[PDB]
Each structure stands twice: as C-alpha cells, then as structure tokens.
Design a binder for this molecule. Structure first.
Ligand code: LMT
Lengths: 1044, 107, 268, 54, 54
C-alpha cells in the first residue's frame, strides 16, 4: 500500500522475486499450439489378412463391439471395417477423461473378446492404443545413389527405427510407409502341381522343419552323486537365410530326385507387405508416420523423438541420411516466437509514447519497467494454475499490456500532475496521488473480474479457450495492481525528479516543449468543448442512440467463426482413383502431381512425399496421399506463394482436368478436431435393414438435400460405394465325394491368394515373419482360379474348375458402424454465412422421412454444437448486473453506476467497424479483443465520474464545475495510455507470416475498438454522468460542503 | 527409508528346456517388439537365461505412478501372448512391480 | 556406488554375439590399461559356456517312419521335462511333470538309450539320425532397449571423480568397430544428468538469500557483510571431515547446510 | 546392518556338486572362526546374483 | 442416469413392434424426487415459522 514507498529496496526485491518467479516458471511451463482440446479416444485396430469387408465386420468387429460393454464415460463407438481386413474401432469420450483409465478399461474389456477371435487375427496382433489423429510429424528416409529399393530402406526403418521410436513417452501409433523384411515364399502353381503338392504340405513343411526346440541339458537337473558336467543341449534351430529355405524338403522321390521348396516356389527375403509404397520426390523412400499422444505436449514429444533418432544417426548405412517432409512443430515455434517478438516490440513503442509525454528519461523508465515484471509474474500464476504457454494465454499477455500500461501510467501520471499543481516534493505527492487512485485501482480491478470472469463460464473446446483467456487477463491484471501498490509508487517517489508548482512543460528549451504548448493549449480546447456539450444534453442522447444501434446492425450481419486457417508452411494433397484400381495407376497419378509441384511451384515447394496405398479412413490400391514440404519463408514473397493460392490453383490444375479426384490442401491450425460450418451426420439402421436398404436410404438423403441450394453445400457422403465382388460359392457336394478335403481346399485357396504367416525367422539377428502366398501372375485375371489343384486323399489333384462356381456382385469395402450398430456417415456444410444450427435442423427434418429402422444421430463435430451453445446472452447479463452492482458499491448510488455502463457501446462499434473494414470475423479473438476494449473504456470513464463525484462531495464544487475539472485533470493520461497502446498494437495488424492471421485478428479489433472508445467517451462520459446523476438528487441540487 | 528408487516393472517367463537363444527368440524379441507405446519410458533390459526364464525389466522416469506403468506394461504384453510358444503361454508370464527391499526373510 | 559406473555396450547393426563379445574384450583390455582413470573394469554377465549340439541329420530319419515332432518332443520330454496336466491333491491344485529319470539322461552317451518308435512299428536309435558337436554359447542373453547388448560394470581410480572416468570411457569406447554404440543405465543414468546441476541450485539459494537480507535491512551492501560469514562455518566442518577421515556424504552435506544456517543466524 | 552376505562363483559350466562343496565350506567357516559373531548361515545353491546356474 | 436412460429408450421407440412395450416395475428414482420435495417443503416451512416467531 504505502509501507513500501518508504522502503524502495523492499519493493525492488518484490519486483525481482516476482521476476525470477517469472523466468523460473518460464523455463518449465507447457507450450503447445493450443491447449489440449481433443476429447479423449481409444482406438483398437485388428488385422485379418485376406478378409473381405463383411468378414472384418463379422469375425472381429462385432465380436468385440459386444464386449465393449461397461466402459466409463462412454460418449460413442465407431467401427471402420475395411476391405483390407483391418478394422478400426474408435471410442470417443467425455472431455479430459484421463486416458489411462479409459484405455485400461477398454483393453480389459477386449480381453473377453480375445478368445472368441481367429488365430489369424490373434496372431497378426490386435492393438489397443491411446492416440490423436493428425500426424505429429512424418520422418522420411532415403538414399543418394539409391543403391537400395523401397523394400531395403523400409526394412532398415522397421529393423533399426520403428521398434523403438514408438517407445518414447508420448507417441501413439507410428505408421510405417513401406514394410519390414519377411521371409517371402511365392508358390509356383504349375511346378507345384507337378511334383504332387498342395500349399498345405508347404505349410506343415516349413513349420515343423524350421523351428527352435525345447531341448534340455547335459547333466540335467537333478543330476546324480558325483556328476561333473553341466552343459546345454542345442537341438534343432530356427533359420537364417534363403538357402536354408530353398533346402527345405517336402517329400523324397523314389529314385533320388527330391522335391525341394527351392524348386517348387521362389524364395526371397521380401517385405511382409507389398501394399503401400512411398515415394519422396519420385525418389524411393520409406517414412515414419508419427501420431501425437493422448494429451502430451507436442514440442516435448517431438523433442524426445528427435533425441532417439538423433541417436540412431551414427549407425545408418551408406548415404542413408534422414529427410524431413512434415512437422507441425516449427509452426508452433515460429508462431509463439512472433507473438513474443511483438511483446518486446509493444513495450518498445510504449516507452516511446511515454517519453513523448513525460519528457524525463529516468521517469519514463518507471512504467517501462512496470510491465516486464507483471508479465513474468503471470507465467508463474500459470505454472501455479495448471496452464500453458499457449496462443490463448500469450495473446492474453500481449493483450493485457493495455491494462498494465494504463495502471502504471495513471499512477505516475497522477503524481506528476499533483507535482505540477501545488509544488510538493515527489514523495508526499506520491503519497497523495496514491491517497486518491488507490481505491479506484482496486475497484476497477473488481469490476474487471466481473466482466472477464463470466467469459470463463463457457462450455466446450471453445470453453477451454475463453477460460484460458479470462484467466491470463484477470490474473495478469491483479499482478499489475499489486505492482501499482508496491513497486510503482515507490518508484514515483524515488527516481522521479520534482517539478515545482505549475511548470507544465511550456517549450522552455525548444524541442520536446513546443509540444507541451501544443498539448496544454489543446486540453483547454477539449475542456471548453465538453463544457460546450454539457450545455445541450438531448442532442447527444440521440447521437448515442445512433451509436448503439449502429453497433447493433454492424454486429448482426457479421459472420461468426471459429479460428484462423494459417499457412503453417507445410501442406498435403489427397488422391483417389475409381472403383477397383491398381497400384500402377495410382503411382501414375502420384507421379503426375509430383511433376506439377516441382514446376509451377518450383520456387515455393521443396519436397513432395507421395504416399501410395494409404489414404485417410484407411488403405487400398485406389488411394494415395502426398505430404508436401515447402521452401523457407524468406524466398516466398507475395500472397500467391501461400497455401490458399497454391492449393486453390493446384486443385484447379487437378480437378477440372482429371479422371480421378485429387485435391491439394492445408489442415487447419488445430491438430485434429472439428471445424466451423459443417458437421458429421450418422445415419443408422436400427431394426436390421441390411447394407442395401441403408446405403439406399443414404441415396434418398443425398438427393433430399440436393433439393435445397438455399442451405446445404457439397452434397456428399464420405465413404466408398460398393465395389465389384467375385463369389466362389463352392458346391461342397461335388468335392465331398471326390476324395478332396474341405479344410485343405480352404487353406490352399487362402495361402494362395490371401497368404499365410507360418513361422518366424532370424534376419541378421532380428526376428521377422515367414509368409507364403502365390506368385504374382497366377492371381490377377479371374481365369487363374483354374491353375490350382487339391491333392486329394487318394493322390489325384482336383481342378478348381471342379468344385467351385463363379459370379459378380456388389458390396462395400468399408463397413462403417456407429454406436454398436451398422451405420453410414454423411458429411456436409451449411450455406456460407449461414449457421450450422439451421442446417442441422433441416437435416433432422429431411432424414426424418426414411424407412422404419433407419434413424438419425450426430457425432464428433455435430456433438460440439447440440448439448451447449447460445450461453452468451446470459453470460453477459451476468457480467452486466454483477458489474452494475459493483458500481453501486463503488459509487454507493444506484443512479450513478449507470453512467459508467453507458460507455459500453463506444468501444464496440469501433471494433466491429474495424472488422468489417478489414474483412475479419466475429471469431473468438474478436470477442477477446472486444473484452479487453470494453474494459479499458470502463477504466477511463470510471476514473472520470469518480473524480467528479469526489470534487462535488469532498470539495463542494458544483455538478458541471466538477465534471469539467474531472475531464480536465485526466484527458492527458487517457490519451497517453490509449495512444501508447494503439502504437504497441500496430505490429499485430501489420504482422505478416506465422499465424499473422491471429495477430491481424487481435490487432484489428483492438485498434478500431480503442479509437472509437477513447475518442468518443472522452466526450460522452460527462454527458453520461450529468444526465444520469440528474435522475438522482439529495445534497447535489448543486452541491457545496465542508471538511473533516 | 522413503520411497526412493525409480519405479520399474519386471516381466518373467519360463520356457522349460530353452537354451539362451531360444528364450531370446521365441519370447524375448516378441515381447521387446510389442512394448511399443506405454507412457514415461526411461529404458528396457532383457535376460534370456539358460534356465529358460526370461526376465524383462522396464525402468521408468521418476515419480511415474507405478500402478499405471505396471498396467500399460501388463496390457501391452497381454497382446503378444498369443504370439508366444505354448510351454511359455501355459506356464505363466509374470508382470510384477520390482525392487529388492524384502522387509524380512523367514526360513 | 560413488566412484564409477554401469556401461552398456550395444550392438546396433545386424551383428552377432561373437562380434559383440570381441568388441567387449577389445574395450575391456584397452581400458584395463588406464589406472590413470579406471580401476576394475569388469563385465557383469555370463561368459560363453561349452554347449552340445545335436544337429539331427534330418535325411537319415525322413523315411524311417519317424516324425520330427515326435523326435523333438521325445528328446525334449526326455532331457528337459514337460508340464502336462494338473491335479488336485489334499485340496490344492499342482503341476504334473513328466521327465526322464536321473541317470538315463545325464552324460552324452545316454543319448543312445532312447529310441523313436516309427510309424510302422520299428524303433530307431538316436545315434541313427542325430549327430553331436561341441561349440560355445552364452547362457545369459542380455538386451538393452530392444537390441542385443552387453553390460560392463566398472569404476574410476580411488580418488578420481566418476565423471572423468565416464568421459574417458566415451573417448575409449569411441575406438570400437561399426555396429557398436555406447549407452548408460540405472545408477550411471540417474546420476549422469544430475551432477553439474548443483551450481544452479546454489544460484537460486545464495541469490535469494542475498535478496532477503537486502529486504530485511534495506541495503544491497549490508547483506554482503552478513553473507561473508559463510566460509567461517565451513572450514570447520571440512577440517573435521578430513581429520575424522570421513567423507563428503549427504548427511555431511545437509549438515554443512545447517551450519551455514547458524552462521547466518548469528551474523544476521 | 547386522547381517551380511558372500557371493560364490564356480568356473564355467561347473556342477551343483562343487557349488554345494564351497557353500558348506563357508557355512562351516562362519560357525568356526566366527563361532562367536555368527548366529545363522543361509546357503543357496543354484541361485546367486550374477545370474542363474548350478 | 434415469434422464439419460429413459432418453435412450425414447430413442429406441421408433423400433418397437406392436405392443413391445416398456414397463416400469422397479424404479428408485421417484422416491428421490418426492423425498427431496418434502425436504424443501420442510425447509421453507422452517423459515416461515422462524419469521413468525420473530
Ligand atoms: C492532441 C489533441 C487533443 C484533442 C483535443 C480536441 C478538442 C477540440 C474540439 C473542438 C470542437 C468542439 O465541439 C463542441 O460541440 C458543441 C456542440 O454543442 C459546441 O458547443 C457550442 O455549440 C452549442 C450549440 O451550437 C451551444 O450553444 C454551446 O453554448 C456552445 O458552446 C462546440 O463549440 C464544442 O463544444
């Protein structure tokens, strides 16, 4: 309070303590792009090699969706039953539901569905994972001379990297782009038919031939009395080479011509899977797909991953240098760095304004030092309140410079004003100013919580946003207040040189002074004016009405929003081919795109990492994707070197001229999580109407929303329509007598065309898989059905054209399910400036006319909007009656509090108008901005009406007389505080690069808001107070009084 | 003494008759391949014994609530349980929280 | 331990046990050459033991009517044992083991007494399809973080600090063949990052102590006059350590602190 | 701590017999030249520290 | 739990055949409801009688 004005060293200590608490709570405080926003979800993945779509849905997916019975906080469950045999069950939860318990409850409910699963599934690994979605980063590997192919490289990745780089402390599922080495055996049908053999004898052969053996010991325990040797029996061992695999014997022939595997099938060290192919810039590569943890800090996980990989760099072979295609890290780094650079700069500019006002350097350092310490201090309240150095709180900082500057400023100012008003020495004057502006500083701090606190009361991801902001602002603000009491006033008394009575600059020296003259002359202007307006009241009442309403219309025809799309410096493009395509044609599309990017974007693009085989929802020959990396920003000038121009015209290049659908894009700033206009409709069959009736219901709907161009945009279902299927409806009769065995016919059909994991082998030291499938050419066109024979009970083979059949039907490659039941998902948007809510209701009303058992439900993004919303009017009504009550407290009138609240619009109409004038959106930042702004207005006016009432009461001066004196005393701080701000804010709206969309979003609302705020209120507030206090009486008919 | 030593969970399986390379190859590498994606991992160490008993201990970052570590471990291992041999699989794999500080030993 | 460490020498490339052990002798003999730093560099594991291979000639039984599964599992259940079924004795479940008897499974010769009864009905002697040879092999196959590895314990010379030996090991295990990398664990891990951290702690300690005395009084110089008492309390503790023959352990360390405390009290 | 221990190792690929030999030697040793300090000696054959083995 | 559960049933209502009706044989819910309404009536009353005494 004061204790400190007499002890400046005690106060300086408090300063430096809060400072290094700042710095200390700075070195170990969470840093993310955003706060952790994505509602927790557990993904389970299952593999059933060779399985049709309906098979992964029915042999594994539905066996488990029946055993996910009795999990906690369960919001919903969703199956992706892929025609690659890989089913993906996503379970999403209530917010912030600590992963570990959910994931442990799910795995211990999955362990009931573990025995009731296949031996093929159970053996290729079922996977229970904690995980985000968007790739935290992707790390490619290549070679200079390319003395190796995709298979070699990809192996090195999976045999030297992917086993441990997913064993950190915050990585979910790395997804290999390639595949690990395996013992690949490819059966040759004609010569496998020759020497009288089925795959089944190949199976049992390599199995029992190749293995370790439960041996035992010489001198076995327990030995016999005197035994004097103990040593290890090493019996039959597992293998090593391809020789040891050629030499594997199937049967001995009568003469001596043995039937070796070598002869009967080709044997090679080859990939465990030849579905996905990875081409970095057209050059062969193998990547690592790193997905973020279920609530781990980004830059810390990437740092740790960068540590293990930077530790593997001393054992990579010739030329194998790592390449870097995609990293969400440097965007966060450069983003927050640009916001801090701005923190520095805003301070700088503010100091300049302050010199131009208080033309004494050692005095101008007073509030210059006033900020860096209220800053540092807040970071420690964040360490103490469980927050992070996220964009929100960072912008709360940069934002709050305004309240801190104002507090420090009005203190130094009030002192200085008194020192030129009486002639007192600093110190007693300091005590004096404090004796007025003290209480005012605590009351404004209170009304300030009363406006930022209700904003903390919102729900959702966005709720997390408003609360993060609400806290750094109220918190930082308390800290500027305590600084205004301990440090600040001691400083005014301490480094500040005394001005004797009535000096007022007045040129006097010839530089800084011609100003003081301009200004004092002008404050007069101001005062003679305000008096001139308090003269006539009705007029300004009307102009006020005009200002509120103008605020109103400006407000409503403003497009709401969610967040900014930022040129993160790294984008990707998605590829999709027509039904039933091949690996070669995909690779064709991808090669083309790869060519385009390295030409018409030769100066902006650096690397294109093409991913063939892996799209989004899953894998297939049809689908491709391309993570593409750009050059450094310094070689990228204009707006045409940016994401929107590049991706838009790239999309032009690929859409309008192509057979398949190929889009280039950049993901929003949020890693995963829903966007704005748009949603995720799930249409569910509930009374069992089968796939056809459902997808058809999807068609009726896809057409029913095609009749309203007035609302719904991009009439699209996001899935894959039914593909051509080829049935082999075995007649079991015409093979059950033939001497042929069913079990053998199946596993031969399979091992031929599905494949079989058999055994395990030792590659250079590393365990890898042992697989048997056909050779290439004996399974392409349907005819190959025939070339395969079952070696029956007797010894005669039987043709496949003997027991089979053959026909062509349709059926989906992706059997999507929602909430435990079969479902199909329709994405879509709302018309542009149209609300998601309106389109949502029309969607509930159109799909309302569907066949019995086909019902509707919403998920993901569409959830975000249904339970919550439109809480704002009540929140701000809270804020307004609670604030009103605070002014009735402060002022101890009911009729007086109104005068400060009337100042509310004056700050708004400036922000709105600034938005509309730039082209921004009533997004989150505009709301934070306006928060801040309405704040500062409140600050100023409260000060003004405060002085007036004091001077009428605590001096017995008249209404008008006092009003004018009040405005008079403090036009100079109001301007200088405000003017310091706007200049400090400028960098934001002027900023370009790294999220400068955010900055532009701050800077905008703030600047405009402020201008109208000060430059109107410093004319309206007297007319507020005057007319309001004249709907109140007692004493002040016109007042005069006495003293203590 | 107080709880002082960085917490760790040991997994051990017995595979009667297996020479060292056998326990390293039927069981140890299968498990070291399926411990991918548990939280707070400091490091991992295996013993493939000529008694056939493999002891794979995982040591974690300090103050990492054991219970949860022992669970992410027992439930990442109960994934590689089918991918194990049947002598092992039937004679028990064992996931235990590990120290050496026996209060007392009673003969 | 105090002076020393727990060195992990690791194979990273597709190498084999022999290559690693060769590296281990390489480093262990090259670092047993520095009492100028390390004393008792010793590996903690088990060395390669004499092991007895029975590389069945698979041909000379492949017709005889015998099945590999039968040969293996009889060999196995012969000399190792087999867990079969479970029985409920006296109330409690227990295991059922079937193994050879003692004397008929000990010395290699005993191999012969075992016969595989083929498909037709004829036995086969084991010396019909087997072999026998003597090689080596580790009884303890150690691994570190997913990869083949071998563990070298060792310390530093009596009065050399643990860290110095560590840096010299870095420069010595630096001279090893490709596919051999280095790493630290347990004690040497926990203790590697936490040694040159102490000075920052006294930065906070003594700097925040100076600011408090700056507070209490009101001067920046007066606290110097009081902080000057610090060594006064120490040289008495050290002097005692050295003269009682004790050592700079933790109980001595917090002790040293307390002393600093009263020095400051009284001086304050 | 009032209780201490000794570690024993036989040469490579040795037998339970020699181990039990050394251990009973030591047990006798403690109950002899340490008859007045030792109360109890607990010998474990087959399980040392260094690893597993006879 | 009852609000969310009866809501679950009312979403299952378009899939119920002829007469396959929901019955409520057993519910601890309404007891809570009236138990509480009686307590608030009591509280209110306590106030009233306090004002009167005063
Ligand atoms: C460094 C820059 C600082 C900025 C300071 C700027 C102040 C200068 C502003 C000058 C403009 C004055 O604008 C203000 O409007 C009211 C209107 O009621 C006028 O007031 C005048 O007109 C009305 C009617 O005509 C009344 O009769 C009143 O008696 C009379 O004084 C103005 O004379 C002036 O008081």
């Amino acid at each position: 309070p004061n204790f400190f004005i007499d002890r400046p060293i005690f106060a300086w200590v408090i300063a430096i303590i809060i400072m290094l608490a700042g710095g200390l709570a700075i070195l170990k405080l969470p840093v993310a792009q955003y706060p952790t926003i994505a509602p927790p979800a557990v993904t389970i993945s299952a593999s059933y090699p060779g399985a049709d779509a309906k098979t992964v849905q029915d042999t594994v997916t539905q066996v488990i969706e029946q055993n996910m019975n009795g999990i906690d906080n369960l919001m919903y469950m969703s199956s992706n039953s892929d025609s690659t045999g890989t089913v993906q069950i996503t379970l999403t939860f209530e917010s912030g539901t600590d992963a570990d318990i959910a994931q442990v409850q799910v795995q211990n409910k999955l362990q009931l569905a573990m025995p009731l699963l296949p031996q093929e599934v159970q053996q290729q690994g079922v996977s229970v994972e904690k995980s985000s979605s968007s790739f935290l980063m992707v790390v490619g590997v290549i070679n200079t001379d390319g003395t190796m192919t995709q298979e070699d490289i990809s192996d090195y990745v999976a045999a030297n990297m992917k086993d441990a780089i997913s064993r950190t402390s915050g990585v979910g599922d790395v997804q290999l782009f390639g595949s690990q080495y395996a013992m690949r055996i490819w059966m040759n049908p004609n010569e496998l038919n020759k020497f009288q053999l089925t795959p089944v004898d190949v199976i049992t052969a390599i199995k029992a031939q190749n293995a370790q053996v439960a041996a035992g010991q010489l001198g076995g325990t327990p030995p016999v009395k005197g035994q004097q040797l103990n040593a290890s029996i090493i019996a039959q061992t597992r293998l090593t080479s391809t020789e040891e695999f050629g030499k594997i014997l199937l049967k001995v022939n009568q003469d001596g011509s043995r039937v070796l595997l070598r002869d009967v099938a080709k044997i090679e060290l080859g990939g465990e899977n030849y579905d996905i192919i990875a081409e970095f810039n057209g050059q062969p590569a193998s990547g690592l797909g790193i997905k973020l943890a279920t609530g781990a800090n980004a830059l810390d996980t990437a740092a740790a991953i960068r540590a293990e990989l930077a530790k593997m760099e001393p054992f990579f072979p010739s030329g194998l240098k790592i390449v870097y295609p995609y990293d969400t890290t440097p965007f966060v780094k450069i983003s927050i760095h640009e916001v801090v650079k701005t923190l520095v700069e805003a301070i700088i500019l503010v100091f300049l304004v302050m010199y131009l006002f208080l033309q004494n350097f050692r005095a101008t350092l007073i509030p210059t030092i006033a900020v860096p310490v209220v800053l540092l201090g807040t970071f420690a309240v964040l360490a103490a309140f469980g927050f992070s150095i996220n964009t929100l709180t960072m912008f709360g900082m940069v934002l709050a410079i305004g309240l801190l500057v104002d507090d420090a400023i009005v203190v130094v100012e009030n002192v200085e004003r008194v020192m030129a008003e009486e002639g007192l020495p600093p110190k007693e004057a300091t005590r004096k100013s404090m004796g007025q502006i003290q209480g005012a500083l605590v009351g404004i701090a209170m009304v300030l919580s009363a406006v930022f606190v209700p904003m903390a009361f919102f729900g959702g991801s966005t709720g997390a946003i408003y609360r993060q902001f609400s806290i750094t602002i109220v918190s930082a603000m308390a800290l500027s207040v305590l600084v205004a009491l301990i440090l600040t006033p001691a400083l005014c008394a301490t480094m500040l040189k005394p001005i004797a009575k009535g000096d007022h600059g007045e040129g006097k020296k010839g530089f800084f002074g011609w100003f003081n003259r301009m200004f004092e002359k002008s404050t007069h202007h101001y005062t003679d004016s305000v008096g001139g307006i308090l003269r006539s009241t009705g007029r300004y009442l009307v102009l006020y009405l005009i200002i509120v309403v103008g605020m109103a219309y400006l407000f409503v025809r403003l497009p709401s929003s969610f967040l900014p799309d930022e040129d993160q410096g790294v984008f990707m493009t998605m590829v999709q081919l027509p039904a039933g395509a091949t690996q070669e044609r995909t690779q064709k599309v991808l090669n083309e795109v790869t060519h385009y990017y390295l030409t018409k974007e030769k100066n902006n693009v650096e690397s294109v990492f093409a991913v063939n085989g892996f799209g989004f929802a899953g894998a297939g020959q049809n689908t491709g994707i391309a993570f593409v990396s750009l050059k450094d920003w310094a070689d990228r000038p204009g707006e045409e070197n940016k994401v929107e121009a590049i991706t838009m015209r790239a999309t032009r290049a690929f859409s309008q001229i192509k057979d398949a659908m190929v889009f280039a894009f950049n993901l929003p700033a949020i890693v995963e999580l829903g966007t704005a206009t748009g949603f995720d409709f799930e249409l569910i069959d509930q009374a069992g109407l089968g796939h056809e009736k459902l997808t058809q219901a999807r068609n009726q709907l896809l057409a029913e929303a095609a009749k309203h161009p007035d609302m719904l945009t991009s009439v699209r279902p996001n899935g894959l329509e039914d593909t051509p299927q080829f049935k082999i409806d075995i007649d079991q009769e015409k093979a059950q007598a033939l001497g042929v065995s069913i079990n053998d016919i199946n596993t031969t059909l399979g091992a031929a065309w599905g494949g079989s994991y058999v055994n395990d082998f030792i590659d250079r030291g590393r365990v890898k898989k042992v697989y048997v499938m056909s050779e290439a050419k004996y399974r392409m066109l349907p005819d190959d059905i025939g070339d395969w024979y079952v070696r029956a009970a007797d010894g005669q083979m039987v043709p496949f054209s003997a027991f089979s059949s053959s026909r062509w039907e349709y059926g989906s490659p992706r059997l999507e399910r929602y909430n435990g039941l079969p479902s199909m998902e329709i994405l879509g948007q709302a018309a542009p400036g149209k609300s998601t809510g309106e389109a949502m209701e029309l969607m509930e009303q159109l799909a309302s006319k569907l066949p019995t058992g086909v019902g509707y439900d919403w998920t993901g993004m569409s959830y975000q909007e249904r339970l919550s919303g439109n809480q704002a009017p009540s929140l701000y009504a809270i804020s307004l009656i609670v604030v009103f009550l605070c002014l009735a407290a402060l002022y101890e009138s009911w009729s007086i509090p109104f005068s400060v609240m009337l100042v509310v619009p004056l700050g708004v109409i400036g922000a709105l108008l600034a938005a509309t004038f730039r082209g921004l959106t009533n997004d989150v930042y505009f709301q934070v901005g306006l928060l801040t702004t309405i704040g500062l207005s409140a600050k100023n006016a409260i000060l003004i009406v405060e002085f007036a009432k004091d001077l009428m009461d605590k001096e017995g001066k008249g209404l008008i007389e006092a009003t004018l004196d009040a405005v008079r005393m403090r036009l100079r701080p109001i301007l200088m505080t405000s003017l310091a701000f706007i200049l400090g804010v400028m960098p934001l709206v002027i900023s370009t690069g790294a999220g400068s969309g955010a900055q532009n979003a701050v800077g905008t609302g703030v600047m405009g808001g402020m201008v109208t705020a000060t430059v109107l209120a410093i004319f309206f507030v007297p007319v507020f107070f005057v007319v309001v206090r004249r709907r109140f009486s007692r004493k002040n008919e016109d007042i005069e009084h006495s003293h203590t």
